[PDB]
């Protein structure tokens, strides 16, 4: 009867609406899940890439600092060596001037020349020859011995 029609209408209405609401609630819950997992995925990936980038640049910076330090110390070492060499060469030129002085003394230069002749015997050569052989003794005498030897 008309009551029957209304009753069936109400029943199907209620159940279709409740099916809709149940779907809506399930969608909302899965949506919160998707919200969480999407934050997780995107943050994880982008953070990983950013960490990689920053860490790589930091490693490059540390390598640059190491190389810069190595160069600085090497230049310090070579500079002290060049100072030492300049000192020793100054000694040699002092010796050369001394020779040029003594040659003026005829009394001494006569004997010295007799000797050389009796022995490229230019003083500019003999001084070089003796000094290159004496280098160890001059090093030891000017700059103190080496303890580690």
């Amino acid at each position: 009867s008309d009551a029957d029609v209304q009753k069936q209408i109400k029943h199907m209405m209620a159940f279709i609406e409740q099916e809709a609401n149940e779907k809506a609630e399930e969608i909302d819950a899965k949506a919160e899940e998707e919200f969480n997992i999407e934050k997780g995925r995107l943050v994880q990936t982008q953070r990983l890439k950013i960490m990689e980038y920053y860490e790589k640049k930091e490693k490059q910076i540390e390598q640059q600092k190491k190389i810069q330090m190595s160069n600085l110390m090497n230049q310090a070492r070579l500079k002290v060596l060049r100072a030492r060499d300049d000192l020793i060469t100054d000694l040699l030129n002092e010796a050369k001037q001394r020779l040029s002085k003594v040659v003026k003394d005829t009394t001494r230069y006569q004997v010295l020349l007799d000797g050389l002749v009796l022995q490229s015997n230019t003083l500019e050569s003999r001084l070089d020859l003796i000094a290159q052989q004496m280098m160890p003794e001059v090093r030891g005498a000017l700059f103190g011995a080496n303890a580690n030897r």
């Binding site: 009753k7 069936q8 209408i9 199907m12 159940f15 279709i16 099916e19």
Partner: protein, 336 residues
């Protein structure tokens, strides 16, 4: 006064000659090869095909009776042509059978499709009628089916629906005036077109199986009024097309059957005589003894000359130069 006799007659003219005898009818042949059973003899092949031809005619004759068409009666008694007119008759009857069978099968299938489509048309029209409270929108959870039932099953069917898919399915029904013919059961019965609405898959299966159990028919239905109009127009055109084709094929059947009944009796007489003649030549001696057929016969004495005269006709009709020869012989066997 009866006497035996025996005929030497060349095979080529033998058929025609025995035919002239059959028309004359004053001759009684006898088996001259009883040693081998009838179902093995020489001309059996021919007789077999003859029988088959006869069957064909019977079948067509039967359809002739099934329809209202009458069967003529001329009175002529032509003779089967000795030459191989059998091939021509075989082709003719093969056509007058194959056409009739194809027409019958197509008529059946097309009647079925026409009736199914008429049911679909009525379902569409009535569903359109139901969707006419107020169709403000132009155009998915709800599942929807529709079909047709035999009237006076609405009470039991409605009860079963409300009892299985308890209180959760809606059904609307409308009588179909101008009762229709059953798709298969083939009787003019009243019908009601019904639309069923249901919630989800499980109830869909419930109602589908219920209707199938109630020997109903569903067919698809539209989902949108645009689809409804589209499919309604399509079905309305296809129904008329089917009506035209059915009328034309039925006219074709009527015409070929009329043509058949014009000559079915003469066809029967031709093929029957031809069967009898070949069955008789079975009774005569064969090439196992001589290329010329040997016949043995009882005849009354006085008709002998006539028989010879009849034989002459056969020769002339057969065109064989050699004549057939009839010889008497003193005998002991009992005359009939």
């Amino acid at each position: 006064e009866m006497t035996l006799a025996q005929l030497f007659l060349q095979s080529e003219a033998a058929y025609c000659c025995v035919s002239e005898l059959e028309e004359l009818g004053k001759v009684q042949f006898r088996d001259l090869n009883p040693d081998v059973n009838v179902f093995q003899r020489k001309f059996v092949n021919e007789v077999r095909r003859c029988e088959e031809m006869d069957r064909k005619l019977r079948f067509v004759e039967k359809e002739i009776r099934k329809a209202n068409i009458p069967i003529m009666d001329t009175g002529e008694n032509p003779e089967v042509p000795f030459p191989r007119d059998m091939i021509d008759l075989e082709a003719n009857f093969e056509k007058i059978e194959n056409e009739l069978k194809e027409i019958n099968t197509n008529q059946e299938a097309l009647k079925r499709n026409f009736l199914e489509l008429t049911e679909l048309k009525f379902i569409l029209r009535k569903t359109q009628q139901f969707f006419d409270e107020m169709a403000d929108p132009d155009l998915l959870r709800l599942g929807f089916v529709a079909g047709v039932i035999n009237r006076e099953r609405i009470p039991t069917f409605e009860r079963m629906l409300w009892r299985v898919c308890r209180g959760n399915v809606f059904l609307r029904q409308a009588e179909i005036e101008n009762p229709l013919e059953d798709p298969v059961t083939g009787d003019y019965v009243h019908k009601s077109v019904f639309i069923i609405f249901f919630q989800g898959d499980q109830l869909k299966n419930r109602v589908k199986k219920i209707c199938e159990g109630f020997r109903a028919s569903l067919y698809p239905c539209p989902e949108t009024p645009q689809e409804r109009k589209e499919m309604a127009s399509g079905v309305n055109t296809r129904i008329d097309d089917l009506q035209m084709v059915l009328n034309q094929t039925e006219d074709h059947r009527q015409r070929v059957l009329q043509a058949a009944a014009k000559n079915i009796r003469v066809w029967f007489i031709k093929v029957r005589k031809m069967k009898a003649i070949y069955h008789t030549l079975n009774l005569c001696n064969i090439d196992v003894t001589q290329k010329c057929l040997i016949a043995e016969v009882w005849c009354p004495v006085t008709d002998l000359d006539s028989i010879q005269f009849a034989l002459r006709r056969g020769t002339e009709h057969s065109g064989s130069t050699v004549p057939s020869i009839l010889n008497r012989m003193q005998t002991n066997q009992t005359p009939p």
